[PDB]
Amino acid sequence: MAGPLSGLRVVELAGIGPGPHAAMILGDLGADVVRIDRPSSVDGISRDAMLRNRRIVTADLKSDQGLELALKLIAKADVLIEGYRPGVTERLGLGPEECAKVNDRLIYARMTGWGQTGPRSQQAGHDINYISLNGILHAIGRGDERPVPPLNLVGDFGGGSMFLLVGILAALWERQSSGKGQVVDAAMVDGSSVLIQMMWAMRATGMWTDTRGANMLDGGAPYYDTYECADGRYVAVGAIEPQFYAAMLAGLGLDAAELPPQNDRARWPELRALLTEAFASHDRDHWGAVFANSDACVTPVLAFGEVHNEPHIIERNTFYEANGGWQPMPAPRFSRTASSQPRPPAATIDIEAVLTDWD
Amino acid sequence: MAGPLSGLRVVELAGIGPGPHAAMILGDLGADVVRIDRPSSVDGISRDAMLRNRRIVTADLKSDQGLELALKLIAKADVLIEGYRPGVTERLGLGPEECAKVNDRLIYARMTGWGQTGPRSQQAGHDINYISLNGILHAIGRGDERPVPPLNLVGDFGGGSMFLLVGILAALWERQSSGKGQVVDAAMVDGSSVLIQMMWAMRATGMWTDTRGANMLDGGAPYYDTYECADGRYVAVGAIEPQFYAAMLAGLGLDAAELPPQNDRARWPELRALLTEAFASHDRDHWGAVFANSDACVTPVLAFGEVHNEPHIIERNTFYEANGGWQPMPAPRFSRTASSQPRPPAATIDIEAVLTDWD
Ligand SMILES: CCCCCCCC[C@H](C)C(=O)SCCNC(=O)CCNC(=O)[C@H](O)C(C)(C)COP(=O)(O)OP(=O)(O)OC[C@@H]1O[C@@H](n2cnc3c(N)ncnc32)[C@H](O)[C@@H]1OP(=O)(O)O
Numbered sequence: 001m002a003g004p005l006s007g008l009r010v011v012e013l014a015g016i017g018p019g020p021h022a023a024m025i026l027g028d029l030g031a032d033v034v035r036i037d038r039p040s041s042v043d044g045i046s047r048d049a050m051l052r053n054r055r056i057v058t059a060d061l062k063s064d065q066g067l068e069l070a071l072k073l074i075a076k077a078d079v080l081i082e083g084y085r086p087g088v089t090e091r092l093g094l095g096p097e098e099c100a101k102v103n104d105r106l107i108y109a110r111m112t113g114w115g116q117t118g119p120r121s122q123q124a125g126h127d128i129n130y131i132s133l134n135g136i137l138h139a140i141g142r143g144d145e146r147p148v149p150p151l152n153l154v155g156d157f158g159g160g161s162m163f164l165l166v167g168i169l170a171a172l173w174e175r176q177s178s179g180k181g182q183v184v185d186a187a188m189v190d191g192s193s194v195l196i197q198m199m200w201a202m203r204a205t206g207m208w209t210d211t212r213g214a215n216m217l218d219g220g221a222p223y224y225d226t227y228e229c230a231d232g233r234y235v236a237v238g239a240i241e242p243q244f245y246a247a248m249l250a251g252l253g254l255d256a257a258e259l260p261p262q263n264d265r266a267r268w269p270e271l272r273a274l275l276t277e278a279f280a281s282h283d284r285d286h287w288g289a290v291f292a293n294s295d296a297c298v299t300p301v302l303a304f305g306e307v308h309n310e311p312h313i314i315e316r317n318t319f320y321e322a323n324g325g326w327q328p329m330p331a332p333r334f335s336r337t338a339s340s341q342p343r344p345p346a347a348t349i350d351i352e353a354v355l356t357d358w359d
Numbered sequence: 360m361a362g363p364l365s366g367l368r369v370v371e372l373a374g375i376g377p378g379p380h381a382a383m384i385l386g387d388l389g390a391d392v393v394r395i396d397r398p399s400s401v402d403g404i405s406r407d408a409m410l411r412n413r414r415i416v417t418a419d420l421k422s423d424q425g426l427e428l429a430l431k432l433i434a435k436a437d438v439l440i441e442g443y444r445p446g447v448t449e450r451l452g453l454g455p456e457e458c459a460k461v462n463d464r465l466i467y468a469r470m471t472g473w474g475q476t477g478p479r480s481q482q483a484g485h486d487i488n489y490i491s492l493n494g495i496l497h498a499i500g501r502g503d504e505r506p507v508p509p510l511n512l513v514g515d516f517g518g519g520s521m522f523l524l525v526g527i528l529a530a531l532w533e534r535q536s537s538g539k540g541q542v543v544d545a546a547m548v549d550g551s552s553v554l555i556q557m558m559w560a561m562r563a564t565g566m567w568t569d570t571r572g573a574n575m576l577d578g579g580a581p582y583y584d585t586y587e588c589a590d591g592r593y594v595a596v597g598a599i600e601p602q603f604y605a606a607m608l609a610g611l612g613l614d615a616a617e618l619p620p621q622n623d624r625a626r627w628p629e630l631r632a633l634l635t636e637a638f639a640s641h642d643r644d645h646w647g648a649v650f651a652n653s654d655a656c657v658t659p660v661l662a663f664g665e666v667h668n669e670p671h672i673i674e675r676n677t678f679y680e681a682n683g684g685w686q687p688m689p690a691p692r693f694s695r696t697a698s699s700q701p702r703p704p705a706a707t708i709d710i711e712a713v714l715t716d717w718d
């Protein structure tokens with residue numbers, strides 16, 4: 001099995017969102033990932049590419065046989081991932097304390113939104129709820145309109161699965177000293193707050209306000225935003241540094257002497273109107289050409305469907321093809337122990353066959 | 360130093376955005392992190408709270424002495440982080456190969472937007488550019504308007520710093536069984552693509568379109584969006600599962616029989632109009648109360664400055680007071696080897712002092 005996490009063994013209690021995303025990535029990087037799902041719900045080989053790099057098994061954990069098979073897998077494994085509400089694995093017989101008795105080397109990884117304790121810890125929720133409570137959602141969107149969710153990128157993945165991964169892997173490094181595992185408490189409300197640490201930093205020093213759409217990186221700055229082109233498609237402009245901004249102006253045909261200063265915020269309305277008219281005068285692909293190989297920080301805003309035609313995406317093999325859709329190749333990349341193409345979802349496997357293989 | 364990464368040694372070549380964020384999290388979890396900045400820019404004690412849990416040193420990497428000193432640090436370290444454009448560390452003579460001469464164990468971590476090679480590899484960029492090329496930016500915002508950047512959470516951090524971290528820690532695991540370091544190539548355009556794997560999976564199975572504002576999780580669904588309240592503040596609604604959706608309807612005062620189906624997408628506009636009027640009839644805190652302890656998936660949308668006053672936030676200590684204001688405490692959390700509160704940014708110490716300390 002290719003990749004730097006070769007040999008690493010993982011048990012995943014099937015759930016939704018961050019849990020499986022973390023499990024995917026471990027698998028992506030070479031880990032041996034085994035996923036226990038309900039029989040209650042499996043109808044052949046899965047169509048969810050998020051379940052790649054997996055062996056799937058079925059098991060009613062409510063039954064006593066279920067429980068004990070599961071407990072055998074765990075005993076032979078380096079990591080457990082579960083993302084149910086607090087108390088669920090306890091009441092199944094699969095809690096940290098019950099796991100610590102069949103394998104004190106276990107990394108016990110708990111993926112929630114709200115955390116393991118406190119008033120909201122039993123409330124159902126999704127991405128949008130967790131980022132609503134810690135200031136993030138309020139900051140996203142135009143100023144004249146209600147906040148807009150950044151899909152489920154910030155709570156589920158950036159501030160969720162990825163902090164679960166850091167926790168698992170940080171704990172594996174600890175386990176090299178002490179010889180013992182431990183419990184990783186990954187909550188989306190905490191992870192996403194560390195994910196946005198920069199704004200908390202800038203806020204402290206007066207470089208960020210609570211007003212939506214009036215900051216350097218939220219769309220309020222005319223040099224960090226998208227612009228509609230002549231064809232109704234878009235470019236992105238990220239020309240923060242004055243040298244890059246100058247390069248942008250020259251490619252737009254605008255003379256700096258006729259525009260307000262880049263960072264004169266009181267004249268951002270004028271500046272925006274000027275840039276808006278210039279970008280509107282040609283189509284996205286024109287600007288893409290004009291600015292390729294420049295430091296102007298102007299790129300075309302591509303739709304998912306067009307990504308596979310972009311030279312730089314093609315050439316670094318950022319995507320692979322599989323079942324009527326492209327999918328991302330593993331990230332990041334390793335010089336010596338490279339990951340390989342992900343193995344698709346495979347039909348289910350008997351939990352015995354796995355206990356055998358793991359010997 | 361408290362945390363699972365006690366006695367990991369990390370050398371950070373100073374940059375902006377992802378590299379410092381990764382370095383911060385490593386520090387947060389108890390790593391020994393030394394940041395080499397240029398003397399050109401160090402004036403006082405640094406007021407960027409992202410520079411917490413660091414020792415700062417200066418060193419002209421272009422002088423002979425600066426280079427030699429840096430290479431002695433790197434020889435005594437486990438991980439090196441650099442976030443310059445490709446070729447830059449090579450020309451300083453701090454490239455992977457020079458580092459492997461003084462330390463075949465080093466994890467060499469390279470943080471870029473576009474990657475190490477390919478047509479855009481030398482192009483300046485920021486977050487908004489990286490996410491423009493791979494379909495992410497196009498998918499965020501309302502459908503009747505131009506895309507809106509989700510701050511710099513998705514390229515710099517979620518698809519950026521966090522993938523650098525998963526790369527550093529997976530390589531440390533691989534090292535324990537091979538004796539050898541390697542090079543981690545973390546490109547924001549790759550990481551952010553994996554971060555958004557759920558949408559690629561969903562588009563593959565016909566459950567996501569390239570139309571902005573027309574999807575389950577992009578704000579197009581009336582049960583997954585924000586709503587403005589009587590006071591001009593907002594709630595977030597995330598009631599995907601029908602039973603959570605039904606609980607929300609009951610709390611709004613809405614008889615399910617008069618509404619269109621939850622998931623009849625052709626009637627979503629009509630459904631949104633009915634929910635809009637309901638939510639508009641009371642203020643945000645009213646709904647926060649009504650739905651406390653509920654599975655309705657309804658939460659108040661808090662601005663940064665309100666977050667310190669929310670019970671679930673206080674009681675889990677997600678933030679600590681510092682500096683000007685609040686900062687996120689480390690994430691995720693560890694049962695046995697727990698992180699401690701971050702140390703505020705050092706004063707510049709001398710690179711020899713560090714060297715004698717590390718001997
Ligand atoms: C249309 C559906 C698909 C929606 C797709 C959405 C994906 C993305 C979206 C934007 C997110 O943001 S995804 C993150 C949600 N939050 C969390 O994941 C954080 C923490 N977990 C939760 O809050 C809950 O899991 C959640 C609200 C997601 C679901 O609640 P639930 O349905 O009440 O499940 P809960 O976790 O409380 O417990 C269910 C358990 O099922 C039983 N048992 C598990 N595995 C097995 C098995 N193999 N065999 C038998 N039973 C199994 C447990 O016994 C338990 O049931 P019980 O409490 O009734 O005893």
Ligand SMILES: CCCCCCCC[C@H](C)C(=O)SCCNC(=O)CCNC(=O)[C@H](O)C(C)(C)COP(=O)(O)OP(=O)(O)OC[C@@H]1O[C@@H](n2cnc3c(N)ncnc32)[C@H](O)[C@@H]1OP(=O)(O)O
Pocket residue numbers: 217240373374375376377395396397398418419420421442443444447451470471472473482483484485486487511515
């Ligand atoms: C917080 C404060 C303000 C932050 C403003 C924005 C914050 C967030 C924003 C939204 C982002 O998205 S941040 C991510 C940007 N992209 C990358 O980080 C991707 C990779 N790097 C780049 O593409 C470039 O670094 C970038 C475009 C960011 C800037 O280009 P550059 O200024 O030309 O720098 P480059 O990397 O090309 O090389 C600069 C180097 O400086 C010299 N030397 C470094 N350390 C030292 C030293 N200790 N002593 C002396 N000189 C030093 C290097 O020699 C090199 O210079 P050279 O090629 O002129 O020889």
